[model samples]
Target chain A: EARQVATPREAQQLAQRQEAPKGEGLLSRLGAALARPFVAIIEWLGKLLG
Target chain B: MNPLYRAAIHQLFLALDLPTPNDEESVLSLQVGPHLCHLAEHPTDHLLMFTRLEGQGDATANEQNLFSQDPCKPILGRDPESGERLLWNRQPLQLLDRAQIHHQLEQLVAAAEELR
Candidate 1:
């Protein structure tokens, strides 16, 4: 029904381009907070509804 | 935003095969064989659209509005004349109203039934 986002590898590449040399501050801390369950949430939300 | 709205949007977009935006502003363009529908100012209407976003705009993540949540579906639809997309926000469906809400819930159930 709809197109999906770029793959995780692609997302990683984009992130590197967007956030390459940031220190372990808000972004990393937030990334760490988001890396696990956030990925799961995105995956779960990506499923097509019947 | 209400968790129920989150659940509602999750259900709607998932059905539509669009990627569920994480809690952040997203300008998504859905390409269906070169026919595209773009959702602009997405995170602004996150709760109503039940999307997750991480920025502030008119539809900032906050308490739900009767007609201000997801400004995508009702905001734009397939154009009847040119078959392109058009914005129509002057008259929006009121999902926050009790009667309308119940009616839509039934639609959801009916959709499920059809799937079954």
Candidate 2:
């Protein structure tokens, strides 16, 4: 995933949420990892709402 | 997190009889059910997608293919029998069981009776 410089903490927290459970294996983990970008998209939604 | 948000989510899943994961890992580990409901809440355009990712096994093979989240990009889901990927987005999901909203309505009715 492309790590953005802004809101490093939020980005990391989002990444943590996307982390796959153990035994789910690397394939599922990669998919989960990619989902973090959606959080930024959600934050963008918040900004738009503002 | 807002207490209201937590409470609202808790109420939502509880009404639907869906299992709520107590831990972060359990939440992620949940099998997406067969049906997914995406509610785009207005104001923030905040999107919440609820999906029952796991199949009940009676679903057609085509429907089952939609359960694969590993290949992130959409694709034609196929099996070895077909020997060719079928064209489609995520598998077509079917809504089964009672609607969760009905449970919410029942709660409301019971609440009103108690108030009276």
Candidate 3:
């Protein structure tokens, strides 16, 4: 199947889930911290893709 | 401000172990250990919680641009280095009962303390 582009809102929702992990482990927290920058980058790319 | 919301905050300030702010009508500002917190209501009836650690500057336009990226989460904005001046909102302020408001504020304060 062909890859489908996500809407800006959908892309943002996905990014939010990825950014804020539910776990409290050190790696989880570190992932969240790293994901912060990616949130903006993903949203910008989503907007451009849309 | 609605009487219920104002009274709710007043009571929360009393109920929490944290120190109280001044007798301001619109904004209630206070210090919780290392973090500074401000409680207020937006003109649009949204309840607001704003917090920052000491020595933090106002969020520049670049930082403000990060807000609203997630419609679900309340993570409004964050400073690059220290994540200061973070803001959150809850709508129709009147919908929040005293107990719920108190619990949320307490949790917010706890999280703020842990951040610093």
Candidate 4:
């Protein structure tokens, strides 16, 4: 099957919201390492918009 | 150093035939066609290939937000702490073999060419 290609914009949206489905190894470690700091920025922006 | 990363690094440099980087510098920066690509080995023992995004180090909020919105999208991400943009593998590093590494590099180069 052909892989679906995402546009830059669509890819961007996916980056912000999607969490890794796996909980072990590098993906989980990376997501965990990133979540706290990145989510804070997301929430801060939301408040700024509100 | 972990044998996995050491072997992976050796494999990468062999594949690219690029000069090996010194230990102090875990990243090797190069231009694959017109795109700026970084092949990096983290202390934590994973390999990362980062393709540069347009704009300066000080990009706008909207620009930064682009990465944050699709955090786990394959081949793309923004480092939460650094705000740097990159495309990366969705799986754990240890699971990737030499062939997959080569394939991802090809994908990265192709993506850069397409995006450019």
Best by TM-score: 4
Tens digit of per-residue lDDT, candidate 1, span B1-116: 34544444455466665566666423333333323333332223322211211121333212222343333223323323334322222112323433443333333222222321
Report clash pairs, candidate 1.
A49-B14, A49-B15, B22-B52, B23-B52, B23-B53, B23-B54, B24-B53, B24-B54, B48-B70
User: Per-residue CA lDDT of candidate 3, range B1-116, in tens?
Assistant: 47656666666655553444445455555444444455666654656655544543333463323433322223335556533456444545666565555544444454443442
Q: List, residue by residue over B63-102, the lDDT tens digit for candidate 4.
A: 4334333222235456665566665543246776767676
Number of backbone collisions per candidate, in order?
9, 9, 0, 9
The sequence of per-residue lDDT tens digits that candidate 1 reaches over residues A1-50 is 34644333322222122225556577756564434457767777666321
Better of 2 and 4 by DockQ: 4
Q: Best candidate per DockQ, number?
A: 1
Can you give the TM-score per candidate against the true fold? 0.26, 0.23, 0.45, 0.47
Error of 2 at B5 (Å): 3.1
Chain A superposition TM-score per model: 0.21, 0.25, 0.26, 0.26
State model 2's lDDT.
Answer: 0.29
**Model 3 ranges off by over 4 Å:** A1-50, B17-23, B53-84, B114-116
Error of 1 at A4 (Å): 3.8
Models ranked on TM-score? 4, 3, 1, 2
lDDT of 2 at B105: 26
Q: What is the DockQ of candidate 3?
A: 0.04
